Structure formats: structure tokens, C-alpha cells
Write a protein that binds this ligand. Structure first.
Ligand SMILES: O=C(O)c1ncsc1NS(=O)(=O)c1cccnc1
Ligand SMILES: [Zn+2]
Ligand SMILES: [Zn+2]
Ligand SMILES: [Zn+2]
Length: 231
């Protein structure tokens, strides 16, 4: 039942409920002649919603809001981008125009600015050092160290035992390293150890792209990252 690229036309977005008040959002983008899905997270916070990541572009992110409005009916008041790449900040200006307060770490904001990508408005303090955690309404935010990018955050929903690894965690079907141009391959496995060591209790692990699993996805990512390092 977890939505795949076969069910989703580029431009559309599917929500998938994972627990009481916890959803993933799924969108697709056309990249290098292939079609690839992407995951973000939606977490209920009283009578409002926190959004983790854009749906990878302005048009998808407009559809994401329309899909949230239709299917959940609570307002998105805050959004957090988990690193500076386009699949996480692309659509921030859409969010901002709809009244969403947009957030990222200063590291992410600076890299976004340097990259010419969209820049979330608000700064998340207290995440500058590997192993830092901060609370953010109904989630904890964790900086595990450099991995997929130097700024990548992971998000844990203490109340549903949901860990959203964003692009620092790979799905099981992904057996070769993705876009590593901005990655710290030397530190990635240590960063994942930090995630393992902080969230030993997670039950649902959502990778940046593709199918959820359990904690095995962390070891899976490590294996793939090491294989790539030994190419
Ligand atoms: O690995 C990532 O997080 C990532 N995010 C957007 S694209 C990408 N990796 S990728 O460019 O190597 C990719 C994988 C599969 C199909 N097309 C592109
Ligand atoms: Zn990325
Ligand atoms: Zn504001
Ligand atoms: Zn990605």
C-alpha cells in the first residue's frame, strides 16, 4: 500500500498515514530521463501541521498543500527543510506565500544561499555540532554529522517512533550510492552510528526516497556507502 512512482504522475502528490497524526508525503520528479519518488513528513501539532521538506519544486509543493487541504484539513503553520538541496528547499517560496513559517539550520541556509537555491526564512539554533538534538514542537531534530550533505538533519517523532532520515538514509532497493557530489563519504557511516545510538527505538524509518522500513535501513545505507567508498 505505500505509494510508488507507478501510482504518481509528476505534478501530483500522495499522502500516506503512518500513525495517528503522522503522514509521509510522496512526490515524483523527472531527473536524467528517470522518474524518482521523494518522501517528506507531515506531523500533527495540536490543530496545526508541521511539514518536513518540500515536495521537490514549486508546482509539486503547491499540489502538496492542496492535497493536505483536501485530505487532512489542518493548516501547515511551519516547515523544516532537512538540507539545502532542491528536493528539500524547492518550493519554500510557495510555502512562504501560503503563510508557512519556513525553517532550516544556519548551515543549510548558508549552503542554499551559496548554491542559489531557495532559502528558508527562519534559523534553527543548536544543531551546529555532530550529535546535537533540539526539540521542535512534535518532533526532535538531530544533526548526526556530515553524510549525504554536511548539513543534513534527521527528524524523529517521539510519539509514533518514526524516524525520517531524509537523504542520509537510503531505501533497501537502492544498492548504489546516489548523488554524492556534496556528501562526506568518510563521515557518513559514523553519522549513521550517531543516528543508531540516538534512536535505537525507532520502529518506522522513512528514507528520503522510496519505501519505508525499519532500522535495517541504517545498516543498509552504511553497507552501500562503504561499497561506494571501495569502488
Ligand atoms: O540521493 C539523493 O538524495 C538524491 N536526491 C535527489 S536525486 C538524488 N540522487 S540521484 O541524482 O543519484 C538519482 C537516483 C535515482 C534516479 N535518478 C537520480
Ligand atoms: Zn540532497
Ligand atoms: Zn516568520
Ligand atoms: Zn534527495
Amino acid at each position: 500500500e505505500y505509494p510508488t512512482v507507478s501510482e504518481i504522475p509528476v505534478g501530483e502528490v500522495r499522502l500516506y498515514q503512518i500513525a495517528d497524526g503522522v503522514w509521509s508525503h510522496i512526490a515524483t520528479q523527472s531527473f536524467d530521463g528517470a522518474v524518482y519518488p521523494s518522501n517528506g513528513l507531515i506531523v500533527r501539532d495540536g490543530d496545526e501541521l508541521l511539514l518536513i521538506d518540500t515536495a521537490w519544486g514549486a508546482k509539486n509543493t503547491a499540489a502538496l498543500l492542496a492535497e493536505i487541504e483536501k485530505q487532512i484539513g489542518l493548516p501547515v503553520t511551519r516547515a523544516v527543510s532537512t538540507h539545502f538541496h532542491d528536493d528539500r528547499v524547492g518550493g519554500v517560496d510557495v510555502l512562504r506565500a501560503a503563510g508557512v513559517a519556513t525553517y532550516a539550520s544556519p548551515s543549510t541556509r548558508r549552503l542554499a544561499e551559496v548554491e542559489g537555491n531557495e532559502i528558508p526564512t527562519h534559523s534553527l539554533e543548536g544543531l551546529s555540532s555532530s550529535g546535537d538534538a533540539v526539540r521542535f514542537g512534535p518532533v526532535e531534530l538531530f544533526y548526526p554529522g556530515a553524510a549525504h550533505s554536511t548539513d543534513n538533519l534527521v527528524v524523529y517523532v517521539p510519539s509514533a517512533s518514526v524516524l525520517y532520515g531524509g537523504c542520509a538514509i537510503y531505501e533497501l532497493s537502492r544498492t548504489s550510492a546516489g548523488n554524492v557530489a556534496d556528501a562526506d563519504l568518510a563521515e557518513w557511516p559514523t553519522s549513521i552510528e550517531r543516528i543508531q545510538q540516538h534512536y535505537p527505538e525507532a520502529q518506522f524509518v522513512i528514507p528520503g526516497h522510496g519505501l519505508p522500513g525499519g532500522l535495517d535501513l541504517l545498516k543498509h545505507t552504511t553497507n552501500v556507502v562503504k561499497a561506494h567508498t571501495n569502488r
